[PDB]
Write a protein that binds this ligand. Structure first.
Ligand SMILES: Cc1nccnc1-c1nn2c(=O)cc(-c3ccc(C4CCCCC4)cc3)[nH]c2c1C(=O)N1CC(CF)C1
Length: 210
């Protein structure tokens, strides 16, 4: 009834997220490989109990339990990615959000290994007023070197099951806050598996409940 149908709330919706590489010869004929992708351009999610994923993220001072405790609970999501690691340039990420409200956002991504934080990236994004709605675009950001390096390490593992073993202990926690009020707008826990070499990237979005 008031349960989300996609990744977002009534205040802030994800429009698109992509992690990609454009090969050097994209200048001659354009092409790009999507490692992971979410697109909600053209439209109730199933749920997962947040307690079962606590141990995949840090456990104090910005941990998932402390964040979920502050709320609001309807802003929390889990995204499972099947990553397309069959490729082979410029490694990039792009994200876009929309809202009916004019806000300044702080977007934080915390990369975790074995449930502990290893790198964090934070950027603020001001709104652009477009067709009645406000849009928040961060396009073609250079991929952080930690994950460019990680992608290259993963690609050279000899077995899909070893890749999945490694990614079992790798997660990303994304928190989008109103920069002016410090209110949380969206929190998404990302977990990862490798897609079969013949299948491209896919995702499954869940509501997080407690
Ligand atoms: C530009 C930015 N500004 C503010 C806050 N966050 C970001 C950001 N930077 N960034 C990076 O530099 C690399 C990845 C990235 C790269 C690779 C992969 C996987 C690794 C495992 C194998 C398949 C590819 C996932 C994410 N993702 C991201 C995100 C950003 O939005 N993110 C939303 C979160 C989604 F995970 C990250």
């Amino acid at each position: 009834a008031w349960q989300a149908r996609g990744l977002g709330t009534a205040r802030l919706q994800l429009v698109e997220f992509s992690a990609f590489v454009e090969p050097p010869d994209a200048v001659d004929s354009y092409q790009r490989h999507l490692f992971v992708h979410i697109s909600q351009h053209c439209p109730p999610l199933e749920s997962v109990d947040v307690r079962q994923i606590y141990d995949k993220f840090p456990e104090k001072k910005g941990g998932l339990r402390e964040l979920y405790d502050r709320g609001p609970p309807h802003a929390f999501f889990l995204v499972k990615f099947w990553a397309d690691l069959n490729w082979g340039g410029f490694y990039g990420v792009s994200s876009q959000y929309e809202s009916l409200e004019h806000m300044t956002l702080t977007c934080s991504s915390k990369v975790c290994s074995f449930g502990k934080q290893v790198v964090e990236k934070v950027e603020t994004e001001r709104a652009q007023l477009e067709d009645g709605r406000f849009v928040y675009r961060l396009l073609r950001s250079p991929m952080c070197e930690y994950l460019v390096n990680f992608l290259h390490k993963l690609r050279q593992l000899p077995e899909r099951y070893m890749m999945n073993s490694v990614l079992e202990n790798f997660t990303i926690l994304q928190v989008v806050t109103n920069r002016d009020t410090q209110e949380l707008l969206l929190c998404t826990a990302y977990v990862f598996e490798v897609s079969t070499s013949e299948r491209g990237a896919q995702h499954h979005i869940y509501r997080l409940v407690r």
